Structures are given as C-alpha cells and as structure tokens.
Design a protein around this ligand. Structure first.
Ligand SMILES: [Ca+2]
Ligand SMILES: [Cl-]
Length: 293
C-alpha cells in the first residue's frame, strides 16, 4: 500500500513547524526514520502495532512535511542540530517513562543517543539497518563506497543539490523491488526543488562516522555503542539479508548485545519497503512481550 498511516500534526519547535504522526493512547512507540525518507517509511509497519500504545512517528527537520531551516548551507542539518530539534519535539510530545524506540539509519543514531541520555525512560529498542558504531571505509558495500566518498567531497553539491542522486539513485537502488509511481512521489515530495531544499540529504552522508571523521559524531556513536553493548534494555534486531549498513563488523558487534532477540528478513537498506509485514509482526510481538496486559 501507498497510503500514509494517520494524520500529520504539527508543533512549532524553536520557530519551525515539525510534522509528526501520533495515533492511539498509552505508553508510546516511537518510529524514527533516517535519510532520505520520512514517517512515510513506516506506513505499512505501524498498523501492526495498533492498540499496543501511542504510535508516533516524526519527520526530522527539513524532511517529510517538517520545515526547512532558513538560512541553509553546508553547515546546516548536522547531527547536533537535528538532535536539538528532535530532543525538543520529544519533550513537547510528553512521552513519559516507558518508551519503545523503533529506529532505522540516522534515526538509529538519533534514537540510540537519546536512549543513552535518558536510559531510565526506555522500555525497549527495535532497530534495523542502523549506525550502531563508528566504521571504516571498507565497511561500506563495495558498490556504493565511491559514491558515498563523492558526497563527502566537493562533488557532493552537484550530485545531490542539482541531480538529487540520493533520492533518484540510492533510494531505489537499495530496495529489492521497484516502487510504484505513487510511492516514489511521496519520497520525492520534500525534495522536488533543486538547491537547499535537498541539503538534508547531502548533510547526512557527510555526518557518517567514517575513519574517525567527523570527530564529534564518531565520539557520540562510540559512546552509544559501548553503552548499548552493556545495557540490559530489551532489544529487537531486525537483520537484513543481504542488508547494506548493518553487515560485516557492525553486524557482529550488534549480535553481542545483551537481551536481544533477532529475526532476519529480506532486504537491502530500506527493508520496510521489502518485508513490511515480517517487520511489523516482529515489532508487535516484541512490544506484546514487554507489555503483557
Ligand atoms: Ca532564505
Ligand atoms: Cl546517509
């Protein structure tokens, strides 16, 4: 299905509208997307969890239906800034102390870090295709390595701001099946305008903690990595075959984490588009185990 889940609501955070879905009552279950998606990514997964809590999915600043930052440029949309907006949004949504996080891609970096800073508020973490630790160049898939190194160079502006490569190539290229015209449309929407409307999709791969740089994200991911491998918080690892980002060393490291159940589903990076029913079912079962009634 191409239909979004829920109705978008909006909240002004530091003078900017942020968009989010919030359905149901009870302890929250937060779904957090990464690059270059939005809450739309979760549309066929969130229904599986209906009645198990308050289902929330936020659009990160500059993505989905949330506002762009003004002014925009190469210093905007770094990890730190996204973190500031999302922290403040999660505050304003009145989440309580029994939060289940469901995370993907940069959503995992954000969610893992937040969970670390608020560990007594977290009831469970489900993650998939996540940035679970700092990596090296060799840990990127062979076929995508050189393109990501290009984004991280001066060639990135032309590739992403003019040609929109992250949306038009990386996104479809990391989904096993072809998207319908309506599904592409929804992912394209926030990035139709060339220029700074696309800055978020370029700023993100420039934040990837690769070979020690950028150093502040390295250190954040190094901190949450250590913590997660030592945390008794229950965890659901949704492993993808063949996967993309959570493979190799990162996958071995994730499997060392305590109090973790694991399932494996078909997919590359955007696995929600390939096996949404398996993922949704597993998340639901996980949340049911943590919230017997
Ligand atoms: Ca302007
Ligand atoms: Cl990225």
């Amino acid at each position: 299905g191409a239909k979004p889940f829920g109705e978008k609501k909006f909240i002004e955070i530091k003078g900017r509208r942020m968009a989010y879905i919030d359905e149901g009552t009870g302890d929250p279950i937060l779904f957090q997307h990464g690059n270059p998606t939005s809450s739309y990514l979760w549309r066929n997964i969130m229904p599986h969890c209906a009645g198990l809590g308050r289902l929330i999915a936020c659009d990160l600043i500059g993505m989905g239906d949330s506002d762009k930052l003004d002014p925009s440029g190469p210093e905007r949309y770094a990890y730190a800034e996204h973190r500031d907006y999302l922290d403040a949004l999660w505050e304003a949504l009145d989440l309580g102390d029994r939060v289940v996080l469901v995370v993907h891609d940069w959503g995992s970096a954000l969610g893992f870090d937040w969970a670390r800073r608020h560990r007594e508020r977290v009831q469970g973490i489900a993650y998939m295709e996540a940035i679970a630790m700092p990596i090296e160049a060799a840990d990127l898939p062979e076929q995508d390595r050189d393109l990501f190194q290009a984004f991280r160079s001066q060639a990135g502006e032309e590739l992403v701001l003019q040609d929109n490569v992250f949306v038009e190539q990386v996104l479809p290229g990391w989904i096993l099946r072809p998207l319908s015209e309506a599904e592409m449309a929804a992912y394209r929407e926030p990035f139709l305008a060339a220029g700074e409307a696309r800055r978020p999709t370029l700023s993100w791969p420039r934040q990837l903690p690769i070979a020690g740089t950028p150093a502040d994200v390295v250190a954040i991911a190094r901190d949450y990595a250590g913590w997660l491998s030592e945390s008794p918080i229950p965890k659901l690892f949704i492993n993808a075959e063949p996967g993309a980002l959570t493979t190799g060393r990162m996958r071995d490291f994730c499997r060392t984490w305590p109090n973790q159940t694991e399932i494996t589903v078909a997919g590359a990076h955007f696995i929600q588009e390939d096996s949404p029913d398996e993922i949704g079912a597993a998340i639901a079962a996980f949340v049911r185990r943590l919230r017997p009634a």
